[PDB]
Ligand binder design. Structure first.
Ligand SMILES: CCCCCCCCCCCCCCCCCC(=O)OC[C@H](COP(=O)([O-])OCC(O)COP(=O)([O-])OC[C@@H](COC(=O)CCCCCCCCCCCCCCCCC)OC(=O)CCCCCCCCCCCCCCCCC)OC(=O)CCCCCCCCCCCCCCCCC
Ligand SMILES: CCCCCCCCCCCCCCCCCC(=O)OCC(COC(=O)CCCCCCCCCCCCCCCCC)OC(=O)CCCCCCCCCCCCCCCCC
Ligand code: HEA
Ligand code: HEA
Ligand SMILES: CCCCC/C=C\C/C=C\C/C=C\C/C=C\CCCC(=O)O[C@H](COC(=O)CCCCCCCCCCCCCCCCC)COP(=O)(O)OCCN
Ligand SMILES: CCCCC/C=C/C/C=C\CCCCCCCC(=O)O[C@H](COC(=O)CCCCCCCCCCCCCCC)COP(=O)(O)OCC[N+](C)(C)C
Ligand SMILES: CCCCCC/C=C\CCCCCCCCCC(=O)O[C@H](COC(=O)CCCCCCCCCCCCCCC)COP(=O)(O)OC[C@@H](O)CO
Ligand SMILES: CCCCCC/C=C\CCCCCCCCCC(=O)O[C@H](COC(=O)CCCCCCCCCCCCCCC)COP(=O)(O)OC[C@@H](O)CO
Ligand SMILES: CCCCCC/C=C\CCCCCCCCCC(=O)O[C@H](COC(=O)CCCCCCCCCCCCCCC)COP(=O)(O)OC[C@@H](O)CO
Ligand SMILES: CCCCCCCCCCO[C@@H]1O[C@H](CO)[C@@H](O[C@H]2O[C@H](CO)[C@@H](O)[C@H](O)[C@H]2O)[C@H](O)[C@H]1O
Ligand SMILES: C[C@H](CCC(=O)O)[C@H]1CC[C@H]2[C@@H]3[C@H](O)C[C@@H]4C[C@H](O)CC[C@]4(C)[C@H]3C[C@H](O)[C@]12C
Ligand SMILES: C[C@H](CCC(=O)O)[C@H]1CC[C@H]2[C@@H]3[C@H](O)C[C@@H]4C[C@H](O)CC[C@]4(C)[C@H]3C[C@H](O)[C@]12C
Ligand code: CUA
Ligand SMILES: [O-][O-]
Ligand SMILES: [Cu+2]
Ligand SMILES: [Mg+2]
Ligand code: NA
Ligand code: NA
Lengths: 259, 43, 514, 79, 227, 84, 46, 58, 79
């Protein structure tokens, strides 16, 4: 049939269900903001999760179970994941740009100073520093997981990945607590705006990245990864380091320099 | 480029039909709306 | 089988066909909007209503022409059809994700439709500047639907960019380096890099507008310490790259068309053409504030942006002269596609040159927010991007369909369109120099003659659009099946016949190294 | 009284098209001076220059809003 | 103001506007020349039966078509930036006037000594006096002294606007929370017209600017008349 | 920098586990201690109805429209001040 | 497998040129008409 | 756990002509129909909401 | 306003062991105030608080050197 190494994918419904899920989530957000109803949004969130679940289930079937991930296919996926992370970096760049724009030139409405009059920042040496050690530590433990996997060590791969996930969850719970304890809010001018939208999109990426690591954990429990072939784990590790690095920029920029 | 003769040749009469139908399909609906503009700006 | 094939596609050719159909339909919508604009302006006074309904039309006209006509046709349509064939690849790297880039566009378009049907529409300009676009001057759902429309179009193109870059880097024959791939492939790869980097910034910016409108943030609201000008920076950091995204695949198609109908095996100065596209793509990221020369920036910043913008003329001029040098010595075939491409070279040059006029911040004070700008960008968009699209459509229609067009009809269509676009837009230079502002539903009486002539031009272009539909019908109606084409040794996309089989390159090409 | 004031002169601290801070600075300078000259036993005539400059440069609504907020206790600049 | 069938800029009313006219003439010469050269070369390429289809070497010719455009760009940028820096120069004004954009009209403040302010609305077409200009007149013009350097400060109290007077070479965006400065100097008395130049909603097309330039003694009489 | 540690020969699983338990998790432990020292609630500040804070240009799409999503009555005053 | 060849690689039929003309007329006509009817809708709305 | 990947390999390589999203068996069809029904129904509902929101109301 | 000055009070701007900037700032403030006054005609008496604070905090040799440099035209702070 073919004598190249690339993957001809079975016709699939998940592109269409994913696109429709986008329509339902966006029109659903519109209904929520303007017509006091969450109905469409809940449908859209549900169909989005169902779509991602079935699509990535199929990628596992195609690779672990059917053998379609030749080295050429794997190399493509490596490029794809790097490019996706680059687009995510540029997304965050827009929020850093907004933060520096506002904070380097504080307008008269703020008091002409930064932090604005009336804003009392979190102490960066308290929970923000703890969060920083948590994500840095999880970058060490995920690297231990990676090396254990490459060396064929199932037990220590699972232990290290579990530690990594635990730390991601710890970060998320620390941040949820800090959001609740924060004496300023998203409606507290451009300080609250930049703080909560930038750390909030970051927190979303922590949750995404943790979920990805959890998927890897269960696939590892099911023996899907070989010591040489485990791109889902590599992609989740790349994504995790990206989440760690964004945090370090947030910490230095918003929590520390911006305090 | 080279090509086989038309399997289903479209005569000049046939072309005049397809052209007229095509032009009408753009012009008549827009025409109807624009003709009735004043009829809209009062309702 | 119909649903499996057309809704569940994982085939680069069928997905390309969907994009071409989508973009054609969008082009009708965008044409209708342009005629409503020109009907309003075609005599003094008010036809439709005040500036609100008028600028809902203007805003929609732009979004439709850019996001639903040009980018889907050039990148989703020609890109999906041609790029795998030109590198001998069996499909795209992510054939299933590719189908989602397509199916996100009908929802995106539906959201734009919804924006114009609810409340009073989004009468903001396609730039969507606050505070006009904020929740006090545009209360209600219209601007939020417009933001969500852009979000879905953005995700479509970001994923498409990831797919094209991966395909083009990873799926060439192992002997083929990047410097053996055709210029259209280069143009798509560079366009895709620009999309990857610029759309997330736009996404950040319009998400901040969304939260200013709905979550009580104040990124752009001075009352909270925000700044409307920050929005403009974020928008244009995307918006200048975006216009190079709109033209670069066009440059790539023009290179192929001019080479082909000059009877040449290759474009003049291949590495210079690659250099020029990479240079334009890079410079396109460092010039955005030439959209902001009247907002109050410091004089040294205006000088930097004047200078950096003008230097893009240098690589662009290399491409223009290389196209001329590709014609040089050719056995010229005066095909309709060649006519489109020749019109492109000249009229794109005129529009690029009025862009260089506008790059001078001092003169831009008088020209900014006038019809001179409108004249500049319709020469590069209505007579550049569109001419490249028409040239590529008539050139490759027999490949995609298996049927030939009537060449005499296609030449008539070119002639009508050429008159119509020049009658529409050339007088708009006079309107701009003499001070007619952008985004006006009506104008002081002195501006009547050229507005009248410009609106007459827009009707001639409408006659061309209608004729194009008939021409495509005539081709499918008569069923002249292609036998052979010339120059297949240097145009690989033709070598599997017309149309190529659903699966091509199941056995890859043989290319050795030596 | 070194006057014959016509309008605010060029201020090298604020040489660019954006004059927002120039209006703000002279408004703060006037009100800081006027407060100093009340709580310590002097004359506000010493503050007159800042008064003329901010009145020349500042939109009336900006002055009016800042005045209202000083009276409310919500003015965010330090006086 | 513009007049019927106008092809170019409104006549320059300020020295900076005359500089722009001469700079535009210089740049348009170059645009016409390059445009016409490209058109000519296209026709030259297309009008011979002589052929040369083998590989052509490109290096030598690409020096010429990078160096020659580079020189031309420099010949545009040099006078362009000269005028840019001229507009920015310290000018020491004798008068400051503020204008505030609104939906949909302009207000003006003359607060150097007296606290004068007023609104400026378009005259509806139905109220125009015979011979007055459709969409361009206002009820209260910006009275100003001719032949004097004036500082205009521009802002907005709602959405963006932009304050423009083409024959003076002026266009300054009106942005809420921001005070933008430009300088105005009319060589002549008279009436000078402009229009809002940033889309601002329903009546963007209908909030014009009219300056009324008069001798200083007459400007003083006018201000004195507002006490 | 070389930091002050010292290992390699081979970076492998054993070394990264050594870093995980010997450096990374001890650091988390110390920061956790540090953090649980400086925990405990600050005196909340006098309310001042600053116009650049407690922004309300549209009601929130939840509750009564006037409470932020993670509103904390102890430390987040409404536009009219703290709640009872 | 799917059908291949001219007029078979498309989601619409070209088996009958007059059926086709109707299809194409509905397709392009509906897109060209939609802005006129949206404008009518907004003018009629209020 | 024990490594049962070979048994999944046998299942998903069975020559039954099923596309991968349905090859796991009847559960796949249920989940697919749930998903598509929600998408298509929600889309129909979103169109209804457009029609409602396009005219003055409340 | 009334006196009873004993020594310079705690100043939240300078809460740490290094008090160099407290001396410097109050010296600048005094001489800035004094220049402002002796101009517009008013009274250096309103500057008195800064004078008492900087005299309390500043080493005699620092004041003396700064005074000498102001007379010389070599004082590097802005007054
Ligand atoms: C044991 C517990 C009891 C003993 C306690 C006695 C003290 C009482 C102040 C605050 C402030 O402390 C600091 O800011 C500096 C702390 C020194 C940094 C060393 C941390 C290195 C973190 C490692 C994370 C692992 C990944 C490293 C990747 C390596 C890859 C090769 O101190 C805190 C701690 C730890 C910080 C996390 C690093 C974050 C980076 C920021 C960018 C008042 C309370 C003061 C407590 C201060 C304690 C300071 C101790 C610092 C030790 C850090 C190093 C851990 C040793 C290994
Ligand atoms: C295909 C046809 C479709 C129909 C639509 C039209 C198409 C356009 C073709 C028309 C072909 C016209 C060739 C040159 C037109 C210049 C007209 C002019 O007098 O320009 C005046 C200036 C401003 O001038 C002034 O400040 C004062 C002007 C009056 C001087 C005193 C004389 C008083 C009487 C005036 C008599 C009129 C003079 C005209 C003199 C005329 C000399 C040529 O305006 C401008 O800058 C406007 C131009 C802005 C940038 C475009 C330049 C690139 C064009 C080069 C190739 C043509 C591409 C066309 C694109 C298409 C060309 C193939
Ligand atoms: C395909 C789309 C496209 C393209 C390719 C371009 C290309 C260029 N554009 Fe344009 N532009 C737009 C679409 C495009 N633009 C749009 C849509 C807007 C409006 C946005 C809005 O406000 O809505 C706009 C606005 C715009 C402005 C802002 C004006 C304002 O709002 O006041 C400026 C200013 O510098 C500008 C400049 C240029 C320049 C210098 C180029 C250059 O890349 C052109 C380079 C080409 C040449 C110079 C011709 C070929 C060269 C030679 C033959 C060599 C010899 C030439 C010389 C020596 C000069 N453009
Ligand atoms: C690609 C972009 C594009 C294109 C092609 C056009 C084409 C046209 N434009 Fe548009 N226009 C914009 C982008 C475009 N425009 C933008 C970005 C703005 C600014 C918006 C703002 O201010 O916010 C604008 C603004 C604008 C204005 C100014 C409004 C104002 O300031 O008040 C006017 C006025 O005449 C105008 C008119 C026209 C006309 C008459 C055409 C005609 O030339 C159209 C004629 C028809 C075609 C060119 C065919 C299109 C269809 C196809 C190519 C599909 C063919 C099918 C197949 C190949 C299968 N446009
Ligand atoms: C466990 C929490 C810890 C980590 C944070 C995790 C979750 C963040 C989730 C999503 C973040 C995405 C959007 C950012 C929007 C704002 C949320 C900011 C983070 C957040 O949660 O902010 C909260 C406000 O949330 C609010 O308004 C309401 C937020 C809910 C509605 C969001 C609706 C808008 C979504 C728009 C997304 C567009 C995305 C487009 C991407 C396209 C890419 C091309 C802060 O609460 P507060 O009470 O004001 O102050 C605390 C006082 N005690
Ligand atoms: C506006 C500023 C720039 C203007 C530039 C105009 C430059 C024209 C230059 C032509 C010089 C030709 C001399 C070649 C020696 O034969 C071979 O192999 C090599 C053949 C080389 C063929 C070159 C053909 C050029 C065809 C016209 C291109 C015009 C540009
Ligand atoms: C070149 C980029 C350099 C950034 C320097 C920012 C420091 C500004 C110092 C004064 C600069 C002159 C004004 C002060 O103004 C401000 O808001 C500045 C606010 C920040 C603006 C950043 C603008 C460019 C953003 C480019 C982002 C792409 C990065 C991609 C990285 C992966
Ligand atoms: C509270 C609960 C909330 C839940 C919300 C969830 C939201 C997102 C969930 C997180 C992402 C989960 C991704 C799981 C991917 C599993 C499939 C997978 O990992 O597939 C791997 C391929 O990787 C690949 O496609 C790589 C696939 C890359 C996926 C990357 C996903 C990134 C996140 C996207 C969303 C970003 C949103 C940004 C918002 C601004 C399969 O190849 P291997 O691993 O080599 O196996 C083969 C070997 O067995 C052979 O021996
Ligand atoms: C306001 C709210 C707006 C909401 C908009 C929401 C719009 C989207 C709904 C999204 C539904 C997503 C469903 C899951 C998609 C998974 C795609 C994926 O994982 O694609 C993979 C490729 O992308 C790769 O790897 C690269 C890595 C994977 C990329 C996955 C990204 C998901 C999209 C999120 C949005 C990103 C925007 C980023 C910048 C801001 C695999 O490609 P396939 O062609 O499938 O198979 C190839 C076979 O060989 C595999 O065996
Ligand atoms: C900008 C793009 C638009 C370009 C212009 C379109 C070109 C004109 C197309 C013709 O359109 C028709 O014109 C008729 C008028 O000639 C209208 O009949 C109307 O007028 C008749 C006589 O006055 C009556 O018989 C009809 O009932 C009444 O509907 C009819 O509705 C409309 O479809
Ligand atoms: C426009 C952007 C500010 C965006 C913001 O306000 O958010 C600023 C940030 C950094 C600035 C640049 C840097 O200050 C470096 C250069 C300084 C020169 O005086 C002008 C060009 C110069 C290249 C600047 C152009 C422009 O003002 C930049 C790019
Ligand atoms: C070196 C590189 C590739 C050569 C090759 O490997 O084939 C070539 C391709 C295009 C060339 C450039 C273009 O021809 C444009 C410029 C032409 C000038 O004559 C030299 C600099 C100039 C910027 C060139 C430098 C260099 O020779 C480039 C960059
Ligand atoms: Cu005000 Cu346009
Ligand atoms: O944008 O040119
Ligand atoms: Cu640009
Ligand atoms: Mg503008
Ligand atoms: Na690995
Ligand atoms: Na009109």
């Amino acid at each position: 049939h073919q004598t190249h190494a690339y993957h001809m994918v079975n016709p699939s419904p998940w592109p269409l269900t994913g696109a429709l899920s986008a329509l339902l989530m966006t029109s659903g957000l519109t209904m929520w903001f303007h017509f006091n109803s969450m109905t469409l949004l809940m449908i859209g969130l549900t169909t989005n999760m169902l779509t991602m679940y079935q699509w990535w289930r199929d990628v596992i079937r195609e690779s672990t179970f059917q053998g379609h991930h030749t080295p050429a296919v794997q190399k493509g996926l490596r490029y794809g994941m790097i490019l996706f992370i680059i687009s995510e970096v540029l997304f965050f760049t827009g929020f850093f740009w907004a933060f520096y724009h506002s904070s380097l030139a504080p307008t008269p409405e703020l008091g002409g100073c930064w932090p604005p009059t009336g804003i009392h920042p979190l102490n960066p040496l308290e929970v923000p520093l703890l969060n920083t050690s948590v994500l840095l530590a999880s970058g060490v433990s995920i690297t231990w997981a990676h090396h254990s996997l490459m060396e064929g060590d199932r037990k220590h791969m699972l232990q290290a990945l579990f530690i990594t996930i635990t730390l991601g969850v710890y970060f998320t719970l620390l941040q949820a607590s800090e959001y609740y304890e924060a004496p300023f809010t998203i409606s507290d001018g451009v300080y609250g705006s930049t703080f909560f939208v930038a750390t909030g999109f970051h927190g979303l990426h922590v949750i995404i990245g943790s979920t990805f690591l959890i998927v890897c954990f269960f696939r590892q429990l099911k023996f899907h990864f070989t010591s040489n072939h485990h791109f889902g784990f590599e992609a989740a590790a790349w994504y995790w380091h990206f989440v760690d690095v964004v945090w370090l920029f947030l910490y230095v920029s918003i929590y520390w320099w911006g305090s | 480029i080279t090509a086989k003769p038309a399997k289903t040749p479209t005569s000049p009469k046939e072309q005049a039909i397809g052209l007229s139908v095509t032009f009408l399909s753009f012009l008549l609906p827009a025409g109807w709306v624009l003709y009735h503009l004043d009829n809209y700006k009062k309702s | 089988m119909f649903i499996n094939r057309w809704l569940f596609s994982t085939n680069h050719k069928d997905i390309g066909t969907l994009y071409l159909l989508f973009g054609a339909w969008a082009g009708m919508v965008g044409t209708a909007l342009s005629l409503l604009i020109r009907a309003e302006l075609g005599q003094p006074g008010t036809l439709l209503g005040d500036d609100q309904i008028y600028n809902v039309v203007v805003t929609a006209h732009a979004f439709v022409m850019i996001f639903f006509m040009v980018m889907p046709i050039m990148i989703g349509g020609f890109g999906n059809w041609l790029v795998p064939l030109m590198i001998g690849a069996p499909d795209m790297a992510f054939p299933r994700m590719n189908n989602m880039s397509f199916w996100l566009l009908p929802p995106s378009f539906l959201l734009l439709l919804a924006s114009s049907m609810v409340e009073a529409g989004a009468g903001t300009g396609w730039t969507v500047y606050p505070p006009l676009a904020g929740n006090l001057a545009h209360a209600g759902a219209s601007v939020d639907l417009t933001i969500f429309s852009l979000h879905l179009a953005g995700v479509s193109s970001i994923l498409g960019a990831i797919n094209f870059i991966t395909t083009i880097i990873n799926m060439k024959p192992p002997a083929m380096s990047q410097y053996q791939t055709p210029l259209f492939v280069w143009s798509v790869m560079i366009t895709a890099v620009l999309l990857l980097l610029s759309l997330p910034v736009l996404a950040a910016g319009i998400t901040m507008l969304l939260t200013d409108r709905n979550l009580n943030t104040t990124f752009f609201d001075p009352a909270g310490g925000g700044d409307p000008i920050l929005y403009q920076h974020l928008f244009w950091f995307f918006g200048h790259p975006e216009v190079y995204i709109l033209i670069l695949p066009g440059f790539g198609m023009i290179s192929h068309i001019v080479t082909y109908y000059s009877g040449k095996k290759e474009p003049f100065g291949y590495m210079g053409m690659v250099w020029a596209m990479m240079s334009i793509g890079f410079l396109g990221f460092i010039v955005w504030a030439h959209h902001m020369f009247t907002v109050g920036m410091d004089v040294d910043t205006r000088a930097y942006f004047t200078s950096a913008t003008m230097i893009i003329a240098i690589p662009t001029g290399v491409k223009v002269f290389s196209w001329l040098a590709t014609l040089h010595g050719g056995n010229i075939k005066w095909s309709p596609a060649m006519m489109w491409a020749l019109g492109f070279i000249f009229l794109f040059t005129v529009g690029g040159l009025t862009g260089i006029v506008l790059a001078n911040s001092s003169l831009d004070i008088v020209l900014h927010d006038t019809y001179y700008v409108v004249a500049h960008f319709h020469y590069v968009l209505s007579m550049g991007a569109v001419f490249a699209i028409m040239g590529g459509f008539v050139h490759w229609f027999p490949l995609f369909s298996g049927y030939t067009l009537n060449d005499t009809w296609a030449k008539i269509h070119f002639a009508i369109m050429f008159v119509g676009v020049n009658m529409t837009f050339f007088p708009q230079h006079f309107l701009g120099l003499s001070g007619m502002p952008r985004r006006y539903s009506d104008y002081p009486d002195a501006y009547t003659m050229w507005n009248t002539i410009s609106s007459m031009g827009s009707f001639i272009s409408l006659t061309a659009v209608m004729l194009m539909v008939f021409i495509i019908w005539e081709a499918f109606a008569s069923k002249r099946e292609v036998l052979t084409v010339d120059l297949t040794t240097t145009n690989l996309e033709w070598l599997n016949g017309c149309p190529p089989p659903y699966h091509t390159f199941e056995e890859p090409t043989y290319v050795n190294l030596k | 009284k070194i006057k014959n004031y016509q309008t605010a002169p060029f201020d090298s601290r604020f040489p660019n098209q954006n004059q927002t801070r120039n209006c703000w600075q002279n408004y703060l300078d006037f009100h800081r001076c006027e407060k100093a000259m009340t709580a310590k036993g002097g004359d506000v005539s010493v503050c007159e220059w800042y008064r003329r400059v901010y009145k020349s440069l500042c939109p009336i609504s900006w002055v009016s809003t800042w005045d209202d907020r000083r009276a409310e206790g919500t003015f965010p600049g330090k006086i | 103001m513009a007049y019927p069938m106008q092809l170019g800029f409104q006549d320059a009313t300020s020295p900076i506007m005359e500089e722009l006219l001469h700079f535009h003439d210089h740049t348009l010469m170059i645009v016409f020349l390059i445009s016409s050269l490209v058109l000519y070369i296209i026709s030259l390429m297309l009008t011979t039966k002589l052929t040369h289809t083998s590989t052509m070497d490109a290096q030598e010719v690409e020096t010429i078509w990078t160096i020659l455009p580079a020189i031309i760009l420099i010949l545009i940028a040099l006078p362009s930036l000269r005028i840019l820096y001229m507009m920015d120069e310290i000018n020491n004004p004798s008068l400051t006037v503020k204008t505030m954009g609104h939906q949909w009209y302009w207000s003006y403040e003359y607060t150097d000594y007296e606290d004068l302010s007023f609104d400026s609305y378009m005259i509806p077409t139905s109220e125009l006096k015979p011979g007055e200009l459709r969409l361009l007149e206002v009820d209260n013009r910006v009275v100003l002294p001719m032949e004097m350097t004036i500082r205009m400060l521009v802002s907005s109290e709602d959405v963006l606007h932009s304050w423009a007077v083409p024959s003076l070479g002026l266009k300054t965006d009106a942005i809420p929370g921001r005070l933008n400065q430009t300088t105005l100097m009319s060589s002549r008395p008279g009436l000078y017209y402009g229009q809002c130049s940033e889309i601002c909603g329903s009546n963007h097309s209908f909030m014009p600017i009219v300056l009324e330039l008069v001798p200083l003694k007459y400007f003083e009489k006018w201000s004195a008349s507002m006490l | 920098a070389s930091a002050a540690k010292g290992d390699h020969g081979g970076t492998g699983a054993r070394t990264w586990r050594f870093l995980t338990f010997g450096l990374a998790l001890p650091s988390v432990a110390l920061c956790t201690l540090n953090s649980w020292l400086h925990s405990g609630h600050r005196e909340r500040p006098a309310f001042i109805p600053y116009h650049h804070l407690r922004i309300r240009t549209k009601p929130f799409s939840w509750g009564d429209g006037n409470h932020t999503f993670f509103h904390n009555p102890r430390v987040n005053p409404l536009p009219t001040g703290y709640e009872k | 497998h799917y059908e291949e060849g001219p007029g078979k690689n498309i989601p619409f039929s070209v088996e009958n040129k007059w059926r086709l003309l109707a299809m194409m007329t509905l397709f392009f006509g509906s897109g060209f008409a939609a802005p006129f009817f949206i404008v009518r809708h907004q003018l009629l709305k209020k | 756990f024990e490594n049962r990947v070979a048994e999944k390999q046998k299942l998903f390589q069975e020559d039954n002509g099923l596309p991968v999203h349905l090859k796991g068996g009847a559960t796949d069809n249920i989940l697919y129909r749930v998903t598509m029904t929600l998408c298509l129904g929600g889309t129909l509902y979103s169109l209804y909401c457009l029609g409602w929101a396009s005219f003055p109301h409340k």
